[PDB]
Symmetry: C3
């Protein structure tokens, strides 16, 4: 027993699941470490009490079951390394992508993808009935009633970290937790529920809860979702460095509206350095208020008298995010106030951005090659009084026949770049007030121009131009400049020209008919016209009266 | 004893603090692991000798004390997991933020926030006497003399990592260390000293020392700070992926000047993918030379004869950083040479950038809604001969009445975007020399224009314009173009017009008075004027002489 | 034996290398953990069988040897913490950087840097014979025949992670692996081979293999390289958050062409949030097809009949990358389709980008101060039919005398920013079609202008301008506007002026010689000329005929 005391003092404590016959039995005996060394088949609702102990759980095997494996009373600072949640049942799933990776949108074609799989696709539900109209009638009731996921449900914990999580038809759910993190997820294949969820509907608002690094795949819901989290003025919560691919709902979601009669909304979260690829709905769905507005107020939240619907000061910190190939909307948001920067949305089947926002600033935005499936939608939509500073809005695909590129009727936009069709923009104001010494260069052309267009007058026709044209041939050393104006809906119809033909003269438009008095406006100005084959001047004199003078003989 | 040898060969070695009565006693007995399983109350200056052993220290409890807990002779490659430093004393702190999150700047109001807390606010000191003038007289001497922090002081170590650090009124200090890292800090609440500090004032310059990921909060000093670190040409050192919130000084700081009679300056460090929120002074303070210049040379550093003050080749790698709501300056720097890219400063109470820099390039910069408290300061300041390529400089807030938007009198700027007031810019040159085929579009307007302004002539009045105006009504198919010039300080006073009224003529300004000979300049040009009610031409002929011809009868 | 069973149930299992006399012997006895507690000197080809066991290998010492240490049959989920590979031999290396950090390019000067070192520089080889012409003849055969590296060779494993790897003349090689990661590398000093390599030439294409975080230094080859990896539509593989410094080849490389008679190419990998500094060849070399084209087809890959050479749909996800000081090309790529965003290449000795690409989009690009050694190369090269949206293309260094800034003859470019020489651009089209209400401001100047240039006519001379000039002096309240045209290769030769001298008149160019009929073009226009000392008008009348009218008496 000299050795018993020596050993107890010098060796690390860990128990291993294979030495017990229930997960609870192993946890009861644990002091420091717990090794999951054999697969463990759990029952729905199986509950494990950690007695407030701060354990390091090292997983080297799987938790298999349908339903929830519930972890209660974990001590703060506990760590779960490499957990793997796998459903027992192999569910029926749809797979709305073809062999070449293209979206399948036709209900009958989507229905024909139906197969049993634990490794790809997702279990269809109410959202799919809207996304693929007609699908609901093509599937049997037992498929529609499925709800398969192996869920790790961590309850009322603080400062618990899950590292390098995996799974098949899996969910990780934190209920009433704070300062909890899910780090470096290992391409978790989702099941029926959101893949990673922080749910704080009761108790204190959620705070300090994050998903950092790693990736999630598929799932019938959203990759990462929050309910009643507030990161506070410190913005202590959210998503940094995460990728979602082929989410059945959205990559990343802040819940909208109410759940269980009280608010599920979120405030002051980060969404940074993250990527959503091919979500069925949105890349990032960051709104607070639901579109269908089924209640007139916000139980448990700020009242509508203080902030109208879609005007909450949600104040998320959104920077350096990327979305590609969304079927819904790339970036969806609502609210008042705040900043959005460094966003890249490219090659989305539906709209690129739909911001139902007021008094928000958007800087350094790229939304290109969106609406490539030609939905009846605009590519970039801003509803309220916002500012856009620097936006690239044209890619390489031919423009869809439906919709505008930009619809931002109450916004001011500067720094719009790309081969954007000038007739497919609706904005409050488009402004570039601080160019320096400037130059327009025409390439592969006989001309260089600065055209002018007045949208109110005509969306499709330039109203006038300043244009330079080469005289003769490349290398001639001579060009001509013109100032033009639209007439009879014909661009450049009326044109004043300097140095055409290298004659070093000015060709001046004159009226071929006798001008009325209104043909001259300002004092000390002259307009020219023809009358009975003679050249005449109509002049407004220094005293403001008008006179006519014959100039030819 | 068969078992003694079997056990010694098959079990992991770890000792636990609860089996001993001093931290030193536990460390002396450690071989591989050390578990901190019970809180440990240390005395200031308590020193622990690790005997060169490479330990993994797993903390599941706190180190509590006022002053420094000193770790000597750690072996290379040691790891400290989840340490938590907590002060013994609960200090008096100020809290210059109100209930709505707004800055409190009035000294009496800041003084009234004084309370005892270990969890938020900071202990005031000499910097606060300048930041909140009058505060110094409102606080008692014992508050002013406080210096509470629980400091983990790691001395002369190599390749030691601290992971998932926490604390309350805490500091982590590395003295004369190299290749040391502080990773994924868990919202460490700072105390009187900088939160994380690498101090290499003696010995070899610091190299390879980083803060990677995670967050720090409050502190009376800077979140992360370096003294006499040089990352070398490899840029092996700095900050990647870190957030600081409500630093009492600056988020991230390279020390300026001398400490203890020798340089504390830094070179070739990274500042990337990092965020400073609501610092009292600067978001990132990256200068090398101090503003007050209390010595004429640089002991231990490059001489002033080689590089004048504010001209050191500090060469930090600064990319993808974000600052919001700073009370001081968002981004502060000095030095010569180098590159800064992808910076976003938004919604700062004081200036957004103050670069006392020479021969530096700034690309893809956003500095918007800065100086919102209307200090007597410009928003964006560059002192020396720099280049700015792409800068967004206007947000949604009304402009402050004081200061310029940009003051960069020796710099060249291209790609300036936003609704920037054209009279609130002072630059060396503003240049956009490579526009392509271009078009100006007016929205919600009867006109579209390209105005011209000559700053020397007038900062506030356009000197002339090319303008298009609709004829009549939306859909008329007709517009008119004018070329205008300023006269008598009235914009567009003198105007040549093409197609006004859809008459297809040119209205030409003429002099209402007899022109002097100087009224025509170039050979083979003509100016028109009125004399005794007749139209005359003043013409410079091919031989260079001038003549007057009567055109009317 | 009560205690034997008690101990076996409560303590963590780990074996340590010092209790054995071969690494295999220790591994055979391992169950859970393995501690490398003493240096281990291995022989080339030493092979260790892990028997499918899922081990955590904690290294606190080095693996020293020349050649490969081979790890077979590792169980999935194994982890190797802090390995350190060090060569036995100290090789002869070159060091083509001088004391001030500048490149050494002269063969004799590079040859003179030859020294024996394990800690910096690299072993020269066939690429250096091309990079430094003449070097091959200056080195002895035994230096040329060297091939020193200590290689950790992990074979046919899944979900194995290496964390915090280090080394001296080291390589980490994964052969036929999947879902393997190399995380937070600790400035591994490379040897003769690529530093980190995923080689999947046989078996299934590589999938899920990454390098995340950390840094690599030197090496004679590329920092990170892939062979026959396909991240699939999910883009599950690549490089995130990594830095390479002074790679003897390229920072990051997708292999081109064939190895061993079958393809070594790669598809659908990420290259994000990563930095290449001072590579001898490229920062990122992301092409698929080799330049020298030594075979007419692609064994094991897509046929040339489907995709011509340089047109593969490689579809890498490239975003937020930074390159500086490359001697070769900063960013090299080829292929068809796809997107590249948020790239920063600055201060490169050779070209900044060489994209042999077709139907690709580039958005938010900075390529500045490239070709600073004045190679016979353009700075930015795009070969095929691409789109560039937003590009900063001028820094602070004087332009090199050789080459163009941009050579993209089949591309369309918008949003080109910087003081780019207008004569050093060759593009398909340069287009800025959606400016808003605009203004040009001249600083430190008597004038403000919008110049026009027609590249076909002249690359170097403006063809015309709209210019504003101050009248008299600062504060006069008066300016004049002119519309000018090029003649006799003299810019602004022919000029129509409004309000010069504040006379409120128009100075109109007229022909000093009798105009031919071709001197007037449009109906109801007039050109003026002198004939025998009189002013005449040449007018095209409403019926289309031309007439001449004498206007003076
Ligand atoms: Na006459």
């Amino acid at each position: 027993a000299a050795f018993r005391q020596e050993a107890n003092k010098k060796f690390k404590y860990s128990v291993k699941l294979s030495d017990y016959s229930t997960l609870q039995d192993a946890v009861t005996d644990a002091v420091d470490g717990l090794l999951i060394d054999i697969n463990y088949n759990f029952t729905d609702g199986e509950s494990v009490d950690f007695x407030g102990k701060i354990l390091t759980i090292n997983c080297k095997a799987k938790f298999i079951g349908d339903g929830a494996l519930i972890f209660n009373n974990m001590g703060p600072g506990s760590v779960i390394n490499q957990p793997f949640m796998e459903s027992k049942t192999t569910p029926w799933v749809i797979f709305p992508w073809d062999a070449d990776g293209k979206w399948i949108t036709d209900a009958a074609l989507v229905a024909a993808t139906l197969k049993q799989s634990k490794i790809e696709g997702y279990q269809p539900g109410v959202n799919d009935w809207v996304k693929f109209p007609g699908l609901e009638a093509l599937l049997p009731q037992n498929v529609k009633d499925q709800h398969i996921a192996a869920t790790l449900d961590i309850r009322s914990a603080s400062r618990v970290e899950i590292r390098n999580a995996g799974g098949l038809m899996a969910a990780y759910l934190f209920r009433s937790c704070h300062h909890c993190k899910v780090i470096d997820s290992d391409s978790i294949i989702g099941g029926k529920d959101g893949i990673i969820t922080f749910e704080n509907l009761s108790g204190d608002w959620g705070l300090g809860n994050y998903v950092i690094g790693g990736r999630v795949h598929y799932g019938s819901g959203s990759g990462v979702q929050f309910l009643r989290n507030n990161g506070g003025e410190s913005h202590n919560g959210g998503v940094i460095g995460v990728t979602s691919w082929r989410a059945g709902e959205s990559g990343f979601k802040t819940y909208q509206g109410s759940v269980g009669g009280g608010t599920a909304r979120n405030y002051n979260l980060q969404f940074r350095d993250s990527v959503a690829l091919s979500p069925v709905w949105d890349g990032f769905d960051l709104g607070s208020d639901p579109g269908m507005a089924p209640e007139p107020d916000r139980p448990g939240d700020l009242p509508v008298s203080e902030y109208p619907f879609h005007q909450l000061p949600n104040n998320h910190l959104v920077d350096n995010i990327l979305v590609m190939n969304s079927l819904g909307v790339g970036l969806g948001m609502d609210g008042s106030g705040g900043y959005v920067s460094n966003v890249t949305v490219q090659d989305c089947a539906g709209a690129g951005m739909l911001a139902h926002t007021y008094n928000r600033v958007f800087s350094n935005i790229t939304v290109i090659d969106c609406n490539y499936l030609n939905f009846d939608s605009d590519q970039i939509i801003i509803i309220g009084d916002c500012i856009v500073n620097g936006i690239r809005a044209a890619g390489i695909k031919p423009q869809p026949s439906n919709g505008l590129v930009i619809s931002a009727p109450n916004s001011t936009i500067s720094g719009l770049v790309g081969n954007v069709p000038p007739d497919k923009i609706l904005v409050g104001n488009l402004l570039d007030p601080v160019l320096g010494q400037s130059r327009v260069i025409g390439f592969n052309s006989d001309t260089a121009e600065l055209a002018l267009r007045i949208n109110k007058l005509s969306a499709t026709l330039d109203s006038g131009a300043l244009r330079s044209h080469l005289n003769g041939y490349a290398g001639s050393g001579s060009a001509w400049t013109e100032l033009t104006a639209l007439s009879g809906s014909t661009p450049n119809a009326v044109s004043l020209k300097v140095n055409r033909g290298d004659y070093k003269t000015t060709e001046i438009p004159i009226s071929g008919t006798v001008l009325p008095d209104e043909g001259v406006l300002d004092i000390n100005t002259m307009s020219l016209y023809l009358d009975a084959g003679a050249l005449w001047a109509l002049i407004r004199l220094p005293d403001g009266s008008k006179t006519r003078m014959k100039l030819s003989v």
